[PDB]
């Protein structure tokens, strides 16, 4: 509350560490469904169904340009990518399985880096 603060958690490396995580996600062999925005002209149903499209390149641009206020808003967009994928793709599909694999990969890096 006013003039009563919990001790200051060092957030000075968060930008660099989120960038490293995002590099690792970018270079994963199952990243290919997520590297670029889904083409809303060429994929029937995507525009209407997926209210907030997100992809690694869009996260990378937001990260590079100071559009994440803190590391939690960064994790929200990464998870959005996987939540979108699960909304649109069957679990038993290459892209569906890619999404599960990447989300697992991300959540471990997240925990190991920050928890």
Q: What 3-state class would DSSP assign to 89? A: coil
Length of the chain in terms of residues written: 115
Spatial separation of the C-alpha atoms in residues 89 and 99, rounded to whole Å: 9
For this experimental structure, what is the resolution in angstroms? 1.8
Extents of the domains making up the chain: 1-115
CATH architecture for segment(s) 1-115: Up-down Bundle (1.20)
Please report the beta strands in 1-115, taking only residues with DSSP state E, as ranges in sequence order: none
47: CB partners within 8 A, 6+ apart:
40
Alpha-carbon distances, residue 17 vs 25, 89, 95 (angstroms)? 13, 30, 27
Q: What 3-state class would DSSP assign to 11? A: coil
Which structural technique was applied? X-ray
- Closest to 102 measured CA to CA, from 24, 43, 44, 42: 24
Q: What 3-state class would DSSP assign to 57? A: helix
**CA angle, 17 then 23 then 27, to 5°:** 150
Alpha-carbon distances, residue 80 vs 2, 9, 55 (angstroms)? 34, 26, 9
């Amino acid at each position: 509350s006013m003039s009563v603060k919990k001790p200051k958690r060092d957030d000075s490396k968060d930008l660099a560490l989120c960038s490293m995580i995002l590099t690792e996600m970018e270079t994963h062999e199952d990243a290919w469904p997520f590297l670029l925005p889904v083409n809303l002209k060429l994929v029937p149903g995507y525009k209407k169904v997926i209210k907030k499209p997100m992809d690694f390149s869009t996260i990378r641009e937001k990260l590079s340009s100071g559009q994440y206020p803190n590391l939690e808003t960064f994790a929200l967009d990464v998870r959005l990518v996987f939540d979108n994928c699960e909304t649109f793709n069957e679990d038993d599909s290459d892209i569906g399985r890619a999404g599960h694999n990447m989300r697992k990969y991300f959540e471990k890096k997240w925990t190991d880096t920050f928890k």
